[PDB]
Amino acid sequence: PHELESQFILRLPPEYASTVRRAVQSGHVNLKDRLTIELHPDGRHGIVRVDRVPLASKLVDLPCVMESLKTIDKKTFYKTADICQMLVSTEKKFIWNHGITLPLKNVRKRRFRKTAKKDVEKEVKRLLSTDAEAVSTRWEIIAED
Amino acid sequence: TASVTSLNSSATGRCLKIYRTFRDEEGKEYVRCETVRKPAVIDAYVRIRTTKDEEF
């Protein structure tokens, strides 16, 4: 079978980004030893090791949706993958508010309505499970108390 | 955060409180009173309860 490739964006500190960029544009396999990525079983934490120097990483969710588009003639472009995650290196914390491009900054707060909200469904399911595992349930919409 | 209108705990300004009766190991009959301070989850629970009542 075929499995869709999973592309994400890696953001590095600027000096380490310059060393990684020089090693990528050089093209030797020396870069392969120099740059490693260890993703922790949290799923939202990692180390990126540049030249064997550990950097602390967080895999965050991006507010917009990016799409990689490949081409052979620079006139027709074929969509290859969807990018929604970034492993910035240096829950609410794992959500990035800004977009990658310069015009998209504070996009989630200003150029996007917070329609993402309505977690709550999971809590409701847990409450239903507790009621099922119970015997008698008493409910009242309340006031200030 | 960009200034936005802040909604009240629902139109009614009413929270949801649930009392649960369960049996512990050996012999016991403890009762748990749990108050939902979130309208979203509370509204979803109320809708589910109404659907269950109709389902009869």
Swiss-Prot record, chain A:
The gene is TAF7. Ubiquitous. It comes from Homo sapiens (Human). The modification Phosphoserine is found at residue 129. This is Transcription initiation factor TFIID subunit 7. Component of the TFIID basal transcription factor complex, composed of TATA-box-binding protein TBP, and a number of TBP-associated factors (TAFs), including TAF1, TAF2, TAF3, TAF4, TAF5, TAF6, TAF7, TAF8, TAF9, TAF10, TAF11, TAF12 and TAF13. Part of a TFIID-containing RNA polymerase II pre-initiation complex that is composed of TBP and at least GTF2A1, GTF2A2, GTF2E1, GTF2E2, GTF2F1, GTF2H2, GTF2H3, GTF2H4, GTF2H5, GTF2B, TCEA1, ERCC2, ERCC3, TAF1, TAF2, TAF3, TAF4, TAF5, TAF6, TAF7, TAF8, TAF9, TAF10, TAF11, TAF12 and TAF13. Interacts with TAF1; the interaction is direct. It comes from the Eukaryota. The TFIID basal transcription factor complex plays a major role in the initiation of RNA polymerase II (Pol II)-dependent transcription. TFIID recognizes and binds promoters with or without a TATA box via its subunit TBP, a TATA-box-binding protein, and promotes assembly of the pre-initiation complex (PIC). The TFIID complex consists of TBP and TBP-associated factors (TAFs), including TAF1, TAF2, TAF3, TAF4, TAF5, TAF6, TAF7, TAF8, TAF9, TAF10, TAF11, TAF12 and TAF13. TAF7 forms a promoter DNA binding subcomplex of TFIID, together with TAF1 and TAF2. Belongs to the TAF7 family. Overexpression of TAF7 in HeLa cells inhibits cyclin D1 and cyclin A gene transcription and causes the cells to accumulate in early S phase. In contrast, depletion of TAF7 from TFIID complexes by siRNAs increases histone H3 acetylation at both cyclin promoters and stimulates cyclins CCND1 and CCNA gene transcription. It is found in: Nucleus.
Swiss-Prot record, chain B:
It is found in: Nucleus. Signal peptide: none annotated. Phosphorylated by casein kinase II in vitro. Changing residue 20 to C: Found in a patient with X-linked intellectual disability; uncertain significance. Coiled coil: none annotated. Belongs to the TAF1 family. It is linked to Dystonia 3, torsion, X-linked: An X-linked dystonia-parkinsonism disorder. Dystonia is defined by the presence of sustained involuntary muscle contractions, often leading to abnormal postures. DYT3 is characterized by severe progressive torsion dystonia followed by parkinsonism. It has a well-defined pathology of extensive neuronal loss and mosaic gliosis in the striatum (caudate nucleus and putamen) which appears to resemble that in Huntington disease. Component of the TFIID basal transcription factor complex, composed of TATA-box-binding protein TBP, and a number of TBP-associated factors (TAFs), including TAF1, TAF2, TAF3, TAF4, TAF5, TAF6, TAF7, TAF8, TAF9, TAF10, TAF11, TAF12 and TAF13. Interacts with TAF7; the interaction is direct. TAF1, when part of the TFIID complex, interacts with C-terminus of TP53. (Microbial infection) Interacts with SV40 Large T antigen. The Bromo domain mediates interaction with histones that have acetylated lysine residues at specific positions. The second domain also recognizes and binds histones that are butyrylated and crotonylated. The TFIID basal transcription factor complex plays a major role in the initiation of RNA polymerase II (Pol II)-dependent transcription. TFIID recognizes and binds promoters with or without a TATA box via its subunit TBP, a TATA-box-binding protein, and promotes assembly of the pre-initiation complex (PIC). The TFIID complex consists of TBP and TBP-associated factors (TAFs), including TAF1, TAF2, TAF3, TAF4, TAF5, TAF6, TAF7, TAF8, TAF9, TAF10, TAF11, TAF12 and TAF13. TAF1 is the largest component and core scaffold of the TFIID complex, involved in nucleating complex assembly. This is Transcription initiation factor TFIID subunit 1. It comes from Homo sapiens.
